[PDB]
Design an enzyme around this catalytic site. Structure first.
Site, PDB file in Angstrom:
ATOM      1  N   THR A   1       0.906  -1.220  -0.095  1.00  0.00           N
ATOM      2  CA  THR A   1      -0.009  -0.064   0.018  1.00  0.00           C
ATOM      3  C   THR A   1       0.835   1.158   0.203  1.00  0.00           C
ATOM      4  O   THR A   1       2.247   1.168   0.326  1.00  0.00           O
ATOM      5  CB  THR A   1      -0.895   0.083   1.206  1.00  0.00           C
ATOM      6  OG1 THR A   1      -0.037   0.246   2.297  1.00  0.00           O
ATOM      7  CG2 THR A   1      -1.671  -1.209   1.187  1.00  0.00           C
ATOM      8  N   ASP A   2       0.349   2.387  -0.248  1.00  0.00           N
ATOM      9  CA  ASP A   2       0.697   3.637   0.137  1.00  0.00           C
ATOM     10  C   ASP A   2       0.922   3.865   1.529  1.00  0.00           C
ATOM     11  O   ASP A   2       0.273   3.007   2.360  1.00  0.00           O
ATOM     12  CB  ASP A   2       0.041   4.785  -0.839  1.00  0.00           C
ATOM     13  CG  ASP A   2       0.942   5.846  -1.144  1.00  0.00           C
ATOM     14  OD1 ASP A   2       1.890   6.242  -0.516  1.00  0.00           O
ATOM     15  OD2 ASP A   2       0.765   6.597  -2.151  1.00  0.00           O
ATOM     16  N   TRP A   3       1.479   4.715   2.149  1.00  0.00           N
ATOM     17  CA  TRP A   3       1.646   4.947   3.570  1.00  0.00           C
ATOM     18  C   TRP A   3       0.578   5.325   4.367  1.00  0.00           C
ATOM     19  O   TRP A   3       0.242   6.622   4.381  1.00  0.00           O
ATOM     20  CB  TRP A   3       2.990   5.838   3.627  1.00  0.00           C
ATOM     21  CG  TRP A   3       4.299   5.041   4.142  1.00  0.00           C
ATOM     22  CD1 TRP A   3       5.149   5.068   5.116  1.00  0.00           C
ATOM     23  CD2 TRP A   3       4.688   3.918   3.073  1.00  0.00           C
ATOM     24  NE1 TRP A   3       6.177   4.081   4.770  1.00  0.00           N
ATOM     25  CE2 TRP A   3       6.084   3.560   3.721  1.00  0.00           C
ATOM     26  CE3 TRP A   3       4.489   3.516   1.960  1.00  0.00           C
ATOM     27  CZ2 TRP A   3       7.029   2.450   3.091  1.00  0.00           C
ATOM     28  CZ3 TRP A   3       5.320   2.556   1.270  1.00  0.00           C
ATOM     29  CH2 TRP A   3       6.485   2.134   1.804  1.00  0.00           C
TER      30      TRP A   3
END
Ligand SMILES: OC[C@H]1O[C@@H](O)[C@H](O)[C@@H](O)[C@@H]1O
Length: 791
Positions: free
Chosen positions: A701-703
């Site tokens: 995922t993105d953060w």
């Protein structure tokens, strides 16, 4: 094994990118600067050279940044008017550089007739530097101080134009800004110098002084107005944007429908010399689904230089409709001396100019196809100035690939359609995009992986899988439901398991996982160099758009070859780049760290970067997969987009990175594509990426990105939805072993809403990836030791 990372060769590699990536737009011979010239440098940003954009891909710590004034002095080819430097220095003591959430630009110093007149009296040429930065979470706005000149910048330019008969304008910008006022003021030369990292001033001085002849080309079309861009109509809404322009993005729109709205076409760039492109032999091989096109590029001017041969295909309109021209190949020449030439030959597979049939009108729905008719190949200096190279005609459709209905839009909307008018020219009409009829729950159920029976007595290490001693299936049986739930969690930022100040650790994120010889693999931003929030220094490289502007995969690869070693030195396994989302609109803030409006160029540049990183066993993570083309509302925003546009434009670059670039790590987005979050999207992460493209690797995922099931509420802890999509890694949690995000992996598993086989698949992806990293080699004691020399 012990390898020297030579810092001077790293510098020289980066400098070569800068000197190949600057784009000269206009010049009357005022460039190159004459030997012994005295230059007056205008613009307060001269003292604070923008080495990068802002945000995650702009936080590389460096000891020193070489700006343009210093670059020019170190060249020893010119001198700088010192009095004017001190006027700027002393004024800036009173008006200090604003570091902010940093602004797009800095306030310009108002100039008087006296300053500018006095400067001209004691110098031969004026250089005016206009600086812009941009980046994450803020979009570039069509206003003074952002996309437009500020009122004081405009005044500066007008005063300098009046008092100097030799004037050079340089755009130290992350992405392109308005050129209308600059063009009206009419400087003698105009060059885009992008943001060149820590040695940017050196490579820029090289081109300005003529030591290197500029050879950079635009990776976007420059239109006269923001409202000429086809996506502006449907860009900048924080909730939802309909990609109504469809495949007609950038030059696909402008060359097809609106040639007169182009100031500078895609692929445009000039040199201190002139070149002549002569079309050569053309053949087609329909059975092999390739054509081969040749041409000769000759330097017809008086100074040595490189040029780029660019090849385009015009497909027959057929029933789908087509852009006039699509880029299919390019090749930059070697340095050609005056009167010399180079023969360029390219072999182009048909898949480079196929079309995705998302309606069924061709007879092959969910396929890439070449519709029946005439295919014309063109070669030239840019898309506009490309001329007939050859043609061939297909009497029937050829299916280049059978795919599936995947990632289809969940609501109807109208898209642009090429309509062939009575006369024969093309106009824009609209047609309804058909709605998805995919049963998503069924598709997941019909393709469910098989569970591997657990066996906790098994004592297999990850070392035993790496050597071939056992199957990955046998190893993975050892993982408990705790181990499985833990291994899908990335730990960070600043996890103690890996080099301090990096983005994440994954894999060996518990004592139990590390006991099985699963190492802690280190992730770190970013495309332009390692971001170390400990304050540690690393090499700051040119921005992505500058890289792409080189049109030179080899020079890019060479530079990232050194980054490969530098990463090993810092024990960073995964650099979080390339950023490779399409330049859909010029106002997207993150355009600086992406490459192009063209998917072929996008994928080819991405692949070069990945090859560089692969040289010594390091790796990249392709991001953001997919359709993160707008920063505003990027947590909530829904991109509504047709299958065809996804397949030909937005996914295409990513596909190339997989098949040509050897990409084995992907990052998903903060946002929604076609009515759900990308981190939970099965069609994206399983059907397309794995089952169709054959990707063997990890998705993260993105953060702190949100995840959901379709229709459900978004949360930062729906890891079950993430695993059901085969998004393997939730980035990030403060403590993965402790489940510090309170995720629903085990509770969903308990309820039969998540199958253990799905967790196991993710665990196998993670372990398979982890065992081929340099972190595994450190466990096995056969890693590369790097020593930095030259400092
Ligand atoms: O810094 C880790 C990640 O943070 C996010 O805010 C950005 O969207 C990513 O591009 C970046 O890789």
């Amino acid at each position: 094994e012990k390898v020297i990372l030579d810092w001077n060769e790293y510098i020289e590699a980066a400098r070569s990118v800068v000197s190949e990536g600057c784009v000269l737009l206009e010049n009357n011979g005022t460039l190159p600067l004459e030997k012994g010239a005295v230059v007056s440098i205008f613009g307060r940003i001269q003292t604070h050279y923008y080495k990068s954009g802002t945000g995650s891909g702009g936080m590389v710590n460096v000891t020193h940044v070489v700006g343009v004034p210093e670059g020019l002095k170190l060249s020893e080819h010119v001198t700088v008017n010192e009095e004017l430097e001190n006027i700027y220095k002393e004024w800036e003591e009173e008006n200090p550089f604003d570091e902010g959430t940093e602004p797009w630009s800095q306030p310009e110093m108002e100039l008087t007739d006296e300053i500018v007149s006095n400067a001209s009296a004691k110098s031969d040429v004026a250089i005016v530097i206009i600086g812009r930065t941009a980046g994450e979470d803020k979009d570039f706005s069509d206003v003074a101080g952002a996309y437009k000149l500020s009122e004081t910048e405009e005044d500066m330019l007008r005063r300098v134009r009046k008092h100097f008969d030799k004037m050079v304008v340089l755009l130290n910008v992350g992405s392109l800004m308005d050129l209308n006022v600059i063009s009206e003021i009419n400087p003698d030369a105009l060059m885009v110098i992008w943001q060149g990292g820590m040695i940017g001033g050196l490579g820029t001085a090289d081109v300005l002084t003529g030591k290197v002849n500029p050879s950079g080309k635009l990776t976007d079309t420059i239109a006269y107005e923001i409202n000429d861009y086809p996506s502006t109509e449907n860009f900048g809404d924080p909730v939802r944007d309909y990609y109504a322009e469809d495949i007609y993005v950038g030059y696909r729109y402008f060359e097809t429908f609106e040639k007169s709205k182009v100031r500078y076409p895609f692929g445009y760039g000039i040199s201190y010399t002139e070149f002549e492109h002569t079309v050569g032999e053309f053949t087609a091989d329909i059975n092999s689904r390739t054509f081969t096109a040749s041409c000769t590029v000759k330097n017809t001017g008086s100074v040595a230089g490189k040029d780029v041969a660019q090849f385009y295909v015009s497909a027959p309109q057929g029933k789908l409709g087509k852009p006039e021209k699509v880029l299919v190949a390019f090749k930059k020449t070697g340095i050609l001396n005056p009167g010399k030439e180079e023969k360029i030959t390219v072999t182009v597979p048909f898949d480079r100019f196929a079309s995705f049939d998302d309606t069924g009108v061709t007879g092959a729905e969910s396929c890439f196809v070449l519709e029946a008719g005439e295919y014309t190949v063109y070669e030239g200096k840019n898309v506009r100035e490309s001329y007939k190279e050859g043609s061939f005609t297909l009497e029937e459709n050829i299916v280049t690939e059978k795919l599936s209905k995947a990632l289809a839009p969940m609501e109807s909307f109208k898209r642009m359609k090429a309509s062939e008018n009575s006369d024969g020219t093309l106009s824009v009409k609209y047609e309804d995009v058909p709605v998805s009829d995919v049963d998503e729950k069924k598709r997941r159920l019909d393709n469910m992986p098989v569970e591997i029976p657990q066996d906790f007595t098994a004592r297999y290490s990850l070392k035993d899988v790496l050597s071939g001693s056992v199957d990955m299936e046998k190893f993975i049986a050892r993982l408990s439901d705790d181990d499985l739930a833990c291994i899908v969690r990335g730990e960070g930022m600043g996890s103690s398991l890996v080099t301090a100040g990096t983005a994440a650790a994954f894999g060996g994120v518990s004592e139990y996982l590390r006991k099985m010889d699963i190492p802690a693999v280190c992730c770190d931003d970013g495309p332009s160099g390692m971001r170390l929030d400990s304050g540690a220094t690393a090499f700051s490289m040119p921005n992505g758009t500058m890289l792409a502007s080189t049109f030179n995969p080899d020079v890019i690869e060479r530079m990232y070859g050194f980054t490969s070693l530098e990463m090993i030195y810092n024990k960073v396994e995964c650099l979080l780049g390339p950023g490779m989302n399409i330049h859909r609109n010029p106002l997207n803030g993150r355009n600086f760290e992406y490459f192009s409006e063209d998917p072929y160029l996008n994928g080819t540049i991405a692949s070069a970067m990945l090859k560089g990183l692969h040289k010594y066993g390091s790796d990249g993570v392709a991001k953001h997969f997919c359709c993160n083309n707008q920063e505003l509302g990027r947590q909530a925003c829904d991109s509504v987009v047709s299958q065809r546009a996804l397949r030909e434009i937005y996914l295409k670059g990513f596909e190339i990175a997989v098949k040509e670039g050897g990409c084995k790590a992907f990052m998903t987005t903060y946002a929604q594509v076609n009515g759900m979050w990308t981190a939970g999207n099965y069609d994206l992460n399983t059907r397309i990426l794995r089952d169709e493209w054959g990707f063997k690797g990890i998705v993260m995922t993105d953060w702190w990105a949100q995840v959901n099931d379709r229709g459900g509420e978004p949360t930062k802890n729906n890891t079950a939805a993430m695993v059901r999509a085969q998004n393997d890694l939730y980035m990030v949690t403060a403590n993965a072993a402790m489940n510090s995000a309170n995720d629903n992996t085990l509770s969903q598993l308990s309820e039969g809403k998540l199958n253990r086989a799905e967790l196991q698949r993710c665990a196998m992806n993670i372990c398979e990836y982890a065992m081929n990293t340099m972190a595994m080699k450190r466990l096995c004691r056969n890693d590369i030791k790097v020593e930095i020399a030259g400092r």
